[PDB]
Amino acid sequence: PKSYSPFVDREDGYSYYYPSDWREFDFRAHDSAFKDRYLQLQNVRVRFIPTEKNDIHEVGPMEEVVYDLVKHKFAAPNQVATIYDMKERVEDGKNYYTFEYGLRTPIYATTSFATVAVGNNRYYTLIVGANERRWRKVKKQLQVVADSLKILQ
Amino acid sequence: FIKEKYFMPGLSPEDAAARIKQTAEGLRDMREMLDHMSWRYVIFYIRLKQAYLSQDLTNAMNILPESRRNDYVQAANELVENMSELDFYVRTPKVYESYLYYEKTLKSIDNVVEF
Amino acid sequence: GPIHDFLLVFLGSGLLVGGLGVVLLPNPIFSAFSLGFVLVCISLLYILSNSHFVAAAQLLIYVGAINVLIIFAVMFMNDSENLWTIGNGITSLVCTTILFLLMSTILDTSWYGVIWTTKLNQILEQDLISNSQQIGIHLSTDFFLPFELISIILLVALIGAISVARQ
Amino acid sequence: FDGSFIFPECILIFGLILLLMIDSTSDQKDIPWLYFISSTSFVMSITALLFRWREEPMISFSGNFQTNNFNEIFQFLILLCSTLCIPLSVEYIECTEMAITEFLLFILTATLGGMFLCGANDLITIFVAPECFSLCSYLLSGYTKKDIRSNEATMKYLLMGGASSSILVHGFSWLYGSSGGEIELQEIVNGLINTQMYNSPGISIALIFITVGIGFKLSLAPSHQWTPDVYEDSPTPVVAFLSVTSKVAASASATRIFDIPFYFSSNEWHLLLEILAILSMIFGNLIAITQTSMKRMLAYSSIGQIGYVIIGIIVGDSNGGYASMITYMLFYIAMNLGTFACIILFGLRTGTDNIRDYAGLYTKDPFLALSLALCLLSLGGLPPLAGFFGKLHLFWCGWQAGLYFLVSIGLLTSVLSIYYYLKIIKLLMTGRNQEITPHMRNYRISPLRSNNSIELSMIVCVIASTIPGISMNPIIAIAQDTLFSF
Amino acid sequence: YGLIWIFVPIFSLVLGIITGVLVIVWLEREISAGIQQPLGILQALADGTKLLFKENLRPSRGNTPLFSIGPSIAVISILLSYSVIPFSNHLVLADLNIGIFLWIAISSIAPIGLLMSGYGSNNKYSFLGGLRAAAQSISYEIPLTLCVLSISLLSNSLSTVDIVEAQSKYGFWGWNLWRQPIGFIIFLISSLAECERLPFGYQTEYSGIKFGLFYVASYLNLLISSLFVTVLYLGGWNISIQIFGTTIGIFITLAKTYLFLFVSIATRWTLPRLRMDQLLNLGWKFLLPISLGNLLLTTSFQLFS
Amino acid sequence: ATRIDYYATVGDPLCEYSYAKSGLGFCDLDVGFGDEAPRGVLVNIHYTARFADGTLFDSSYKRARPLTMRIGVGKVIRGLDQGILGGEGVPPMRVGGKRKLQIPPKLAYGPEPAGCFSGDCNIPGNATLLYDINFVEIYPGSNTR
Amino acid sequence: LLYEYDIFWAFLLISSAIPVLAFLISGVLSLQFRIRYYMFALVFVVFDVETVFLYPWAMSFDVLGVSAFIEAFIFVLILILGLVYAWRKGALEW
Amino acid sequence: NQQELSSVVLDIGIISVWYFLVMPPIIMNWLRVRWYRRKFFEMYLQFMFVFMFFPGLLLWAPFLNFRKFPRDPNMKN
Amino acid sequence: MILEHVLVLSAYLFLIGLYGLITSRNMVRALMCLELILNAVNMNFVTFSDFFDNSQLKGEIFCIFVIAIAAAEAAIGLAIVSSIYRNRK
């Protein structure tokens, strides 16, 4: 938390950070989603699935849940899903998966460093991405923003 | 071609029994469309199938005995209000209430096909 | 819901009577302003068709730029005059039979059954949702060739309109 | 991203930028060098298209534009029409005191729109490029600006051309709906049977409205009433350029949007083209007998010769290819621009277009009379000229495909074309000192600018109407290798 | 509940723009009482009811539907585009993905109302005046939408709430005053000149309620041009160099539109008519090429961003 | 059900379907020899299209031309894109190849009657189609766009 | 989906019913030939279509690099060459 | 689906009656007592203030009580 | 869901503007009828893009192009009509 804004949501349980004064807007199915006022793809958003599960580890393995999460639930057919390496953390007692992919349409060069979580009969799928034309400068910054999602009760 | 179906005469109660099982099986697999957030095909399918249900329930109730009428109309109007609130939360698009009322209309269509 | 498609039927009735006002009124000025009413209803139909940049583009370009010059040339009244401009027995016949073919084509076609098909190329790729951004990415570089061509077309249209309308 | 396959049109847009830079600097002190940079822009576009000959039929842009050998050939024919027709208005502009600038712009952009219509593959460009060409057509037709009849005729043409393209694009809309949301000709037939709409009334209305719009573009006898009315007052060079370029680009589209997205409904497709072809062959050649004008009956002869081209459209690639249609379009350009060159020279020396003024041209000018008579005999085809062997290759391919009732009607109307052609050749050969007109007797070949390029292109068209019927085997040898039209 | 919560922002916005046009009337009266030297606040509503309670005044011409809807379309061509203003981070009427583009369309349908006014009046005076007013609404649209385009090109967004947020990144210098003052001058002259205010009738048969419609349509045109001065160049709610943020941001944007009202009325009283020849000399041979020029400048400048 | 558009063919060599993870009936008859089919390009196949029982409703040999398809971008059934390219690591086809496919109605057009021109339908609900793809060639100049 | 302009239809309905209602409550309770401005509108219509083309490009220029920059640079080059044509000819003349 | 406030009453109505009651007599009083004692900078900011602060002046527009006594007179009516 | 009625309205425009394009006294009424025909095809493309093609907005992109060409056609047609009006007395 060098210069980061911990926007918590004590009702829904999620809480994570933002680099520098990203704005506020209503996304189509995400709640805050907080775009960065200059770019069009650089934003971090998170949504909900009312499941009846408790752990992301019992619903499936990480390397297999990212496959049907990106290749079947994220990627539009006109773009290809370059799923990069996937990572796992444990915050307090719960697993915390974090992965990387790039949606490559024949136009629209972009990618996303999305992470996934669960709890409270919800299902967190925090997605942050940016353009592919400038991603190596915005790699570790969005990474250290993205791994900072906490699940609190 | 529902505009000609207005001009065409109404369906049979057994035709309604066929179309309600078809409508059940078609509401099974809109999960491909919800998670991709294709809300325009979702509002197309919900408004069309609600237009089918509004003429389908009153036609399909006429083959059921009076023991089945009370609980059938109970589950049917439960399905009607669940589908209308699903219509309201897709014409005000939020993913959570949409999938919640989608599971509600699945667990209300699973026994209308049971009649 | 019912307000949406009742608004659709209301726009349909108003637009068809405005189009018959374009076709069958004694005043060409009355026909041009009925055209303006029709194109306002067209923009409202495109709002109903979930194509909003399209809607305000047709509202911007086609009464704001077209119908102004239309009513300019209509108030500056000029002169009067097998598919050709020979009527009262031909265009009624082909109008009724092409109308009957199109009514038997639209009404007798399960359109929603075709909407059920080809559903994979409208799953609305998740990283963008906004309509004008999507128009701009499909217009600038995807259909780059007609985008570069209408520049030449409107260039030649301006140059020819100068070289004709002055004389 | 690099679309290097559209470099002959990059030379055209480069010439357009140079046209506008010359059209902004001085505006008065450059008549001939502007014509020089435009004609050399044509020649550079041709040599670029020949430098890109052996390239693959690669869809260059983002599923938008296909540089097939078939499309390369039709672009070559449009460039050849523009090259062999561009000197035919270097005297008309200085005779009628119009602007040679923006006229060269109109011809360059009509050539541009035709060359994009040849390679157009999305349904967008099969509306953009034909009506690019058609807005350039309306600007070229409304260009004399001295009378009421020319402007009324081109306004009626603008009405009919907008109706033409709008029916064509309503059919394109029924394509776009019945075939899912698919465009790109290769993907449209996929989109019909992805949606299971091959046996549909919607695709039937699509095919009917598309073929009506193309028949408006091809001026076939249902949709043909525009050409004589609109080729009276519109000037003879743009009558030449627009008729020939419009019908070659419309036959380009009439192969292109009819073989690739319509090989499933090919029965009703062949039947609709057979109806329009037989009526066009009969009625163009049967109106063109009885008219006292020269450009009107030429417009009907152009209708009849496009009705001959539709026999090559109906036959497939296999049982007599589209190569016959290609070489007949080459012959058609070659022997029609010579006819219009002679009609232009009768009007740069007389001023009239009445056919009864032709009595006595053999006595006054045997060179122009020989050129016009030989072009008309090429168009009719009595000796071994170009057009006889073109009609022979057409009727050969139609007879080998079994289209007996196309070939026989084409032969009867070829004889019917022979009649009004030799009706013309009566006048410009004979003369009896009062059948000559006072618009003819004062011919005055000597009050002329110089050794013109009208005469050069005219004698090139005369030789190209004579010897390529004799030398047809290299032309067939270079036309049969267009098998990628699919 | 199904329509009350939806109707009350529309109702509050109509009441807000009625209060704003009351402000513009009495504020031009206040600047005329400053440069020309209580009860006066309600005198503007007295003006509105004097123009309201009157005679219909219909002559014998048979264009009665166009006579009815002429000033009506002239009002609609401003009133339909008040769904566009982000007064704060909230309380905008719609989300409005195409923010200013709908305003350009609704301001471009204004010469339709001007030609319907020129034909609804059976007078050659208002005929020529409707021709002039429609032609200057046409003529001043292109550098208007050019500087609109240049600001939306700086922001890379058309939606107005996004550009209002986007102006507050560098701070006070992040506003479009210091990003495009040239395009700001373009938007100044296009805002003042289009509404028949900075240069200059055509109501010689419209009276009663129709004259009041033209009255409120002109001053609401001034209102919406001023609110776009606020949401384009000056900022929406940001003063960088819960519930209270909305209440202070509406005060910020109303101070900014009062600033532009004072500047616009003062520039009206210190400039005469352009005499209709320098008007077009400006809007075609000067204003449109320099609007294309700073369009090319902002097009070259957004490469590094 | 009806409107089968009777095109009597000779049939194709039957085989057992080595099933996929996504329930695809999958049987590669003839391994092609050449390059794999690229994602997003136009490809030319032949096929005979059959219902559950094997009655024919569509054929590329009916049209006597290889059907041009841009595969992988979802312009066709996902059964096509998962049985020609392969979704769950199923091997992609090579040129001059032949393959039978039992498309499950999950991959196919659901219980929805795909195609209904006038009362009667082209495809009934849950048809569990049988495609017999003859992947013959790549389109000559084709792009991934 | 009828959520973006769901309030805008009611806004249109109120704003469209209010002038006719104002007319009801006000009724119950008490040949030139100049084509210069025509020529201005004739230049306006094609410049307006070119601005319509310039609208979604500048909407969507952020996702694209220098390629869309030179796309619309060629476009506005055509635009300014038409404008210089309008200068040098007898187009505006006012 | 947020409902970030969850306040039923007395959140904005209190601020509305505050801005509509406490503000307009002090605003009109500052318009009265500073009608001449002003720079054009001061008249500029007062014009901006009275533009911002308009619709609260509706209950104070017809009423006018402490307005007219530029002497020390007696009510001799 | 009657939303396929806008196609019926589209065909209604496509017939009435064609009828007005055949029987027309002057030229500008027929030009306006031609514009209604371009509207009919235009709303057909917009409806088909709404129904089927929403990832690519190919029908809506073609809507932008067909309204551009409609503008060019109307501009040059009115240029011809105005030049006739100049050339008559």
Task: Give a quick set of tags describing it.
part of a larger assembly, 9 chains, B: 115 residues, mainly alpha, 77% helix, I: 89 residues, Helix Hairpins
Description:
- This is part of a larger assembly, with 9 protein chains of 9 kinds.
- Chain A has one domain.
- In chain A, 11% of the residues lie in helices and 25% in strands.
- Chain A has helices at 62-70, 139-146; strands spanning 7-8, 14-16, 43-45, 80-81, 87-90, 95-98, 103-104, 110-112, 115-119, 122-124, 127-131, 150-151.
- In chain A, the strands form 4 sheets. A 4-stranded antiparallel sheet of chain A has the order 5-6-9-10, with no helix packed on it. Chain A has a 3-stranded antiparallel sheet with strand order 1-2-12, with no helix packed on it.
- The longest helix of chain A is centred in the middle third of the chain and has 9 residues, at 62-70.
- Chain A is globular and about 40 Å long.
- In chain A, 38% of the residues are buried.
- By secondary structure, chain E is mainly alpha-helical.
- In chain E, helix 1 (4-35) packs across helix 11, helix 1 (4-35) packs parallel to helix 12 (244-270) and helix 10 runs antiparallel to helix 11.
- Chain E starts with a helix and ends with a helix.
- In chain G, helix 2 packs antiparallel against helix 3 (66-88).
- Chain G starts with 5 loop residues before the first helix and ends in a 6-residue tail after the last helix.
- Chain G has a single domain, classed as Methane Monooxygenase Hydroxylase, Chain G, domain 1, CATH 1.20.58.1610.
- Chain G is built from 3 helices and no strands.
- By secondary structure, chain G is an all-alpha fold.
- The N and C termini of chain I lie far apart (56 Å).
- At the C-I interface, helix 1, helix 2, helix 3, helix 4 and helix 5 of C face helix 1, helix 2 and helix 3 of I.
- Chain A: It is a peripheral membrane protein.
- Chain A: This is Photosynthetic NDH subunit of lumenal location 1, chloroplastic.
- Chain A: Part of the chloroplast NDH complex, composed of a mixture of chloroplast and nucleus encoded subunits. Component of the NDH lumenal subcomplex, at least composed of PnsL1, PnsL2, PnsL3, PnsL4 and PnsL5.
- Chain A: Belongs to the PsbP family.
- Chain A: One of its GO terms (biological process) is photosynthesis.
- Chain F: It is found in: Plastid, Chloroplast thylakoid lumen.
